[PDB]
Nucleic acid binder design. Structure first.
Lengths: 235, 125
RNA sequence: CUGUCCAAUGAGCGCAUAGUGAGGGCAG
């Protein structure tokens, strides 16, 4: 027992729970800060950028462009659009108490995010070691998902591709491989056959990996490029 | 010529002929599953007479789980040199790296299957 | 039918679905 893969599976799940809570906090933080500076959300689309920007700005919008740390967070073009939009914002300064609670949740969120990254890294590193080739094809994360359900690299390899495409499924017959990045970077029309294709190659990659071969991912890479080429063909 | 040491046990030219004949006959009698994937299924399901693999398969690891499944289920497995050759015996214009002769009810092929099984069990030492 | 491209290292199918398993594109 104590197989490392189960550790990584569960670390990878945390990551999803932290993504969820971060999404919720962003929504909260947007809503609360709406009164100070209602136009900003439209200007800073990236949640984390938005939260970092809010933490930086605070109660005083004026002079935002002049700030040297905000220059670190947003593009100069954007800094200038927000600065100009600040001068004509229709929102009132916040109470000491609402400002303070806003800052508290902003801090909470950035701390959450740092831990999120720390875990993402850990999952990447260990997955690249546990299934170098598999990882290369679908990413550490998806790979960890299909390993968790399967119950390890050996139990996964003893599976036929068609069942590996069905893992984590419950429009139709879409499981983890379908919801993978590589598959999702295609137009919906091509996703089903793309999922089929990725599954097949992941089946090959898992088997190599069960025997601790091509430990530098050569196979994973060949397979990936072979998969990407067909993607190009269909375009 | 040399084959990956890992493709064990490899059939010589005589056994190779018999194997491919029997595979071809099984394709006709419909007791033949073709492809590493479908061969895996027949093993998990418990309906495999014996397994035949191409030592041609690259990376060889893509079929190496089969001998493991086999050892557990007590199913004979053998290698031949050529996946193009196996392909042809499976009716397919394409190379076939693994295939399974499945159990069938009152098979005419029974005696021949039994005979092939024994030959393969001999090579396992 | 014929030519060609793809395809058991999985074509096509898609609540038989922990499944299916040889066929498909294009051109005459």
């Amino acid at each position: 027992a104590a197989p490392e893969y189960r550790v990584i599976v569960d670390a990878n799940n945390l990551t999803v729970e932290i993504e969820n809570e971060l999404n919720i906090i962003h929504k909260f933080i947007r809503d609360k800060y709406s009164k100070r500076f209602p136009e900003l959300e439209s200007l800073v689309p990236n949640a984390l950028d938005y939260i970092r920007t809010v933490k930086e700005l605070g109660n005083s919008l004026d002079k935002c462009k002049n700030n040297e740390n905000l220059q670190q967070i947003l593009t100069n073009a954007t800094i200038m659009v927000v600065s100009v939009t600040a001068s004509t914002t229709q929102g009132q300064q916040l109470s000491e108490e609402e400002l303070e609670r806003l800052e508290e949740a902003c801090d909470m969120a950035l701390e959450l995010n740092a831990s999120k990254h720390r875990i993402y890294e850990y999952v990447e590193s260990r997955m690249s070691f546990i299934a170098p080739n598999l990882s290369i094809i679908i990413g550490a994360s998806t790979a960890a998902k299909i390993m968790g359900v399967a119950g390890g690299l050996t139990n996964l390899s003893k599976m036929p591709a068609c069942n590996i495409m069905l893992l984590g499924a419950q429009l139709p017959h879409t499981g983890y491989i379908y919801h993978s990045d590589i598959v999702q970077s295609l137009p919906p029309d091509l996703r089903r056959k793309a999922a089929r294709l990725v599954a097949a190659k992941c089946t090959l990659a898992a088997r190599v990996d069960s025997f601790h071969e091509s430990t530098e991912g050569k196979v994973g890479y060949e397979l990936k490029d072979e998969i990407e080429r067909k993607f190009d063909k269909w375009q | 010529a040399d084959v990956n040491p890992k493709a064990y046990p490899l059939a010589d030219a005589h056994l190779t002929k018999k194997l491919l004949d029997l595979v071809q006959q099984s394709c006709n009698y419909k007791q033949l599953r073709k492809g590493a994937n479908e061969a895996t299924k027949t093993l998990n399901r418990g309906i495999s007479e014996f397994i035949v693999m191409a030592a041609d398969a690259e990376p060889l690891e893509i079929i190496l789980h089969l001998p493991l499944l086999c050892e557990d289920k007590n199913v004979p497995y053998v290698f031949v040199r050529s996946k193009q050759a196996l392909g042809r015996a499976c009716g397919v214009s394409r190379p076939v790296i693994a295939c399974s002769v499945t159990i069938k009810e009152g098979s005419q092929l029974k005696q021949q299957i039994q005979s092939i099984q024994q030959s393969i069990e001999r090579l396992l030492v």
